[PDB]
């Protein structure tokens, strides 16, 4: 139910992971080390976050697993863009890891990704994305992936959840008081951006799967696991 759902999402927000720039100047290696060490740690907290979304843990294990494998980079990115929204030309990875767009030139393949994240972040800024809309949109990213039946009432339980979160977003948007027509346009403007997020995610995933092939960076633990696929 929308007010309570939104409060839950609010209270579910994972902590900021703190990381710092290396002492020495960035190299392609040490930059990817920093961003993957960050991502790995944020993955750990993404799991706890997902478990706090009402109904998530009532889904079958395979369903929880597969939504998470499907959306994790999207969710890392969505949280990154939200942290960066008020800082044009920068990506706020952590309070002490603030990358200028040009620093992406340090790693082959990464500048484009930064540019996509930066443009999506500018689009959110232009729309004046509100904190409560960002909460619903992030939870929608988790809940809105293709499932196509696996071979293992969970899928019905998923639909009900995504419904509730979409309702919660429509309800958040109704608070602005704008015209019916403009409330529709805003919903569409927000949701159309889900594609950009998925598109950047895909480019991020492939970047990391390629780096992992080049041993351009060793990856560990949770991140390694998620990438192994």
């Amino acid at each position: 139910s929308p007010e309570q759902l939104v409060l839950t999402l609010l209270e579910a927000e994972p902590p900021h992971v703190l990381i710092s720039r290396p002492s020495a100047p960035f190299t392609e290696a040490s930059m990817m080390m920093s961003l993957t060490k960050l991502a790995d740690k944020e993955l750990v907290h993404m799991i706890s976050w997902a478990k706090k979304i009402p109904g998530f843990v009532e889904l079958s294990l395979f369903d929880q697993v597969r939504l998470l494998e499907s959306c994790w980079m999207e969710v890392l990115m969505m949280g990154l863009m939200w942290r960066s929204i008020d800082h044009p030309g920068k990506l706020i990875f952590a309070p002490d890891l603030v990358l200028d767009r040009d620093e992406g030139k340090c790693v082959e393949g990464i500048l484009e990704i930064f540019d996509m994240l930066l443009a999506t972040t500018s689009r959110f800024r232009e729309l004046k994305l509100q904190h409560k809309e960002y909460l619903c949109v992030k939870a929608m990213i988790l809940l809105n992936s293709s499932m196509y039946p696996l071979v293992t009432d969970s899928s019905r339980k998923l639909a009900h959840l995504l419904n509730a979160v979409t309702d919660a977003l429509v309800w958040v948007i109704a608070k602005s008081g704008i015209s019916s027509q403009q409330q529709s346009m805003r919903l569409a403007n927000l949701l159309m951006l889900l594609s950009h997020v998925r598109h950047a995610s895909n480019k991020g995933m492939e970047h990391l799967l390629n780096m992992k092939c080049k041993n351009v960076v060793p990856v560990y633990d949770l991140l390694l696991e998620m990438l192994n696929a």
Partner: peptide
């Protein structure tokens, strides 16, 4: 396979 994910979900 989701050797550690299973772990943290359960």
């Amino acid at each position: 396979r989701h050797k550690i994910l299973h772990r943290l979900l359960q």
